[PDB]
Write a protein that binds this DNA or RNA. Structure first.
Lengths: 614, 637
DNA sequence: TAGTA
DNA sequence: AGTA
């Protein structure tokens, strides 16, 4: 038990009016698919006045009825709907009932933006305000500020989050900037709004003879909107959406905007000071009481004992000291670039196996996926020759492409590890890990974790980066202390999540000759918790207990020590079954226990220990 | 069997197309806002219509036979809630050749549309698309049966109009679903919109008040139609929960006042003289043809007659020569092996049905081979335990499972087969209501079970084009993303397997599915025969567009594997009648350079047979050779 | 089949 | 909140 500072700040409690927002019913025309309703009301909230937000399938507003735009239209994905709001008088909400308070926070959050607008002599993009300018150049003008956020606490009061930030601003414009010449970037942005894209390559075609699906020209599309009012920037550029990147879509460099002395980033003490400042400065135009730094009781997590042949501090050092369990191994390499094995990889593997007195064979893959039958053939031969797992050096492939390859391998019963080829040696973190995986998948128990945890099976699900398992998905899973399992991949989202877990569960009944008593499921919060409904219902019919935990890297906030320094692994409890996890300024992991009858500390310890060994 | 037999098709030849119709007007279209690329074709079909006249979709534009001045060059559209605006750009006249499979398909679309336009302007007669219903046959309160014929009009590779005619009857309802139900008639299966021809699956009625039932975004269900002026002159009635039926699981609301029950022969009752004997059918199709012919103005209909060859019957043989596959069950299999079969009873009891145990015990006895008749005492697919009982069974040597189960949805059927095949257990379905004296169904089911078990029941004579033939199926679905199954036959009976797309991840490109299904069959064939097949026969369902096999074909080419891609359609094959005398069983009727019919009566059918239309799309093999192999594969299984 | 409710 |  220790005391810590969170980058939050309590403000005044909400008054009785704010706890009793106005509600509004909505009618749309034409009626959209029920799955589209919610994103649309959110849009309806913007169309309407300000400090108004979506509530249920209606709206909730903090501002007077006579200020909202009760009628109009909104366009979404090219389609246009007519909306109409209907007042129905104030409705009370409890800050204490997750649901209702989601609204209050949404309201709270919209307000901040509304208040952030009025502030002048400073520019605000969304919730990110910017005071002092950090640089100035022919096009770049790095400003200094912080990303903000405002919400409601279970107490029923305001809560401000503050965190120092940068912003590389380009006032040049793609074509121009690409014009007095620079190398095209990876991610670009438009000129008419805030939506960002990933630059795929550049337009070798004519932007007026290049027709979109309808048959409309790329130029006419934008021209007939007002975006071409003599803003000629008119070179063609092939862009792609941050979501689902091959489907590539055409755009215009002249209607885009890209993304040596140095303020990279300040220390901990400096940032926690710069943050405590803005809380005072922003508390100025906020007029919501006087900021109060939030103290949170943080618990000290136990450092786990790892065992290779001899004690070891990290799994990586097992590659020099030796593995916990050894066996005669055969590992083949598949190269999707050039040649044989890079020297430092052959070396370590030899070193590590020497140090374990185990025999090691190193094959090399005689084929490439593009030869059809031959490939499958090669894999079977290699599988026959004792190959127990495959290492794959390869240029960066799309999520979809690798899953596919691991499947051609998996069908020839070949576990695999994918090491991206522009191999950066000096990046040991990377390749030392790639090898641990390869070894774990080959069946080697590199390190043993001395334990005391509820889950004998922890499976983590992957959807790439999508907010859904619609387009198939993938799962990785370990048998508790040391038993990396047969990681899988697989229509309807619920049915997807379930097969993933069905197979893994099955792999484990294969190894342990018994079903796991309990399972720990880890997933990204970006995916609706409901997609797991079927898997959980399935686990129940089996009697398999479980705990469902949502994960989210960025968005945790910040943790600062009172006066000393922060320990290696920390556990910070929060508002209702939510808690932070901090390891080794650092970035916390925000976690949520959405289902399961297991204490948060137990869970915290098991995730942390799972984190310790990559 | 080599003799030729003249035969009359229910087709008729019309004047050749004049130069003008060989050079339709072409028009470029443009849509705003740009829709998803997968909506462009469905939308152009809509533009073709909005534009009016005899105009059809051609590529990414239109093609028309009516004067360009008659078209509606500008208008709006709506496709599933979403709406867009279109503008046409007349780009002159452009020639098409009947010899080219693609261009000919377009000219025929124009013809089909021509038939529609002429039918739509007919006096006192009833039209339901390409169908015409001329006269009454019975009526009674609110309903009325009409008899006419569904028709078709297309162009040939020769370049002349061809008219198809087949008598049909239609039962029309003269009132609303509200009226009909008010007067006591039962709940029909399917309902049609009153304001258009869209139909639906009626699920049930609802107690909710239309006036206050809210559609997704909040609009009342009543205001939805009310505003669309569909209410003018009607009564909304009560709420009717309806289904797509392409999305049979999701209910949408509707209203009885705006619905018209789609009546069936059952609904009416009151043995109502509706069924046409082959003789009466034939004279009626000639009579209607004469009729539509005068109204069509495309010359006089000359019934098309063709040469129908009787294909050579296959030298079938198990342990010794045989007249039919099921005979091997008692004379012994062509080539036996130790065999293990497990029976999975999803109906209600315990074992092997006495008559099934007998045939099997006897079949193997005649073959002189060891057999084990297992029984899965594992419950239906309920639990990871089931997955376990299966793994155990395969480990213990089972080679195939016989599933005795009540009829399954074909989704649930493919699921189960997927579970089992997983664990390496092939399968054969046999629907539960089974009775001793139903020799035809179960003797065959037993043959599939054995063929799948790796057991070669019967072998076909010899010398066929392909030594490996694989069929593809997407079950109704017009593409191989959403599902995909394939069955491979070792050519001359060496039965290979059954399978479907393994487990990969992410959106799937059809060409990759198709490729993988074949990819698997080749390995099956590999392991089971020692080498890759020299030539393969790929049979696909016509509903699907052949573009999806491109990757697959290029792969075979790369591999050094020859092929022939033939597409099958049990629909629109027309009819076939004798000119005189009666008609045999396995007939081969070639029609064009690359198309033929295949007929097969059996028992002695009083009705008329619907032949199978087959189209040779890729390949070098003669049609006759291809018809033999397919025909022989059909009987064998 | 051109066309949610 | 807002395809190209």
């Amino acid at each position: 038990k220790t005391e810590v500072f969170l980058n939050r700040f309590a403000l005044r409690p909400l008054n009785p009016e704010e706890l009793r927002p106005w509600r509004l019913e909505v009618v749309l025309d034409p009626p959209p698919g029920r799955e589209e309703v919610y994103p649309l009301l959110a849009q309806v909230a913007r169309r309407a006045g300000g400090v108004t937000v979506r509530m249920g399938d209606g709206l909730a507003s903090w501002s007077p009825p006579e200020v909202l735009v009760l009628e109009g239209t909104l366009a979404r994905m090219g389609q246009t709907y007519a909306y109409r709001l209907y007042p129905k008088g104030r409705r009370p909400l409890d800050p204490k009932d997750p649901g209702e308070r989601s609204v209050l926070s949404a309201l709270a959050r919209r307000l901040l933006q509304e208040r952030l607008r009025r502030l002048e002599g400073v520019w605000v993009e969304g919730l990110a305000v910017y005071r002092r300018e950090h640089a100035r150049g022919p096009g770049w003008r790095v400003l200094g500020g912080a990303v903000l956020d405002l919400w409601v606490s279970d107490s029923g009061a305001f809560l401000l989050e503050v965190d120092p930030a940068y912003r590389i601003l380009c006032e040049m414009s793609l074509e121009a900037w690409l014009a007095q010449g620079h190398p095209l970037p990876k991610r670009v942005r438009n000129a008419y709004d805030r939506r960002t894209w990933e630059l795929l390559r550049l337009g070798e075609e004519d932007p007026k003879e290049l027709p979109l699906p309808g048959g409309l020209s790329l130029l006419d599309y934008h021209a007939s909107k007002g975006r071409l009012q003599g803003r000629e920037g008119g070179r063609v550029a092939w862009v792609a959406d941050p979501k689902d990147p091959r489907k590539p879509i055409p755009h215009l460099t002249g209607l885009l905007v890209p993304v040596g002395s140095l303020a990279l980033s300040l220390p901990w003490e400096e940032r926690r000071r710069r943050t405590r400042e803005i809380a005072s400065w922003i508390g100025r135009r906020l007029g919501l009481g006087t900021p109060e730094a939030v103290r949170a009781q943080a618990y000290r997590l136990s450092i786990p004992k790892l065992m290779g042949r001899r004690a070891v501090s990290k799994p990586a050092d097992a590659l020099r000291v030796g593995f916990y369990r050894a066996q005669e191994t055969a590992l083949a390499l598949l190269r999707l670039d050039g040649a044989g094995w890079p020297e430092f990889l052959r070396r370590a593997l030899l070193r590590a196996f020497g140090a374990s007195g185990a025999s090691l064979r190193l094959h090399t893959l005689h084929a490439h996926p593009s030869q059809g039958l031959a490939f499958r053939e090669a894999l079977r031969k290699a599988k026959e020759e004792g190959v127990q797992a495959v290492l794959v050096l390869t240029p960066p492939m799309a999520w979809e492409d690798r899953n596919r390859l691991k499947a051609l391998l998996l069908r020839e019963g070949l576990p695999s590890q994918i090491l991206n080829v522009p191999l950066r040696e000096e990046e040991r973190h990377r390749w030392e890990n790639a090898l641990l995986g390869l070894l774990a998948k080959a069946g080697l128990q590199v390190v043993a974790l001395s334990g005391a945890y509820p889950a004998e099976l922890a499976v983590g699900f992957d959807a790439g980066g999508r907010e859904s398992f619609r387009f198939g998905g993938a799962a990785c899973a370990v048998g508790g202390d040391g038993g990396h399992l047969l990681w899988t991949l697989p229509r309807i989202p619920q049915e997807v999540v379930w097969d993933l877990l069905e197979e893994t569960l099955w792999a484990f009944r294969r190894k342990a000759g018994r079903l796991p008593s309990r399972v720990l499921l880890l997933r990204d919060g970006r995916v609706p918790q409901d997609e797991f409904a079927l898997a959980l219902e399935a686990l129940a019919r089996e009697g398999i207990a479980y705990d469902l935990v949502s994960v989210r890297k960025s968005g945790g906030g910040r943790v600062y020590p009172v006066q000393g320094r922060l320990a290696d692994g920390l556990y910070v409890p929060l508002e209702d079954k939510t808690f932070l996890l901090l390891t080794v300024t650092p970035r916390p992991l925000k976690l949520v226990h959405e289902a399961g009858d297991t204490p948060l500390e137990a869970l915290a310890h098991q995730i942390f220990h799972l984190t310790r060994l990559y």
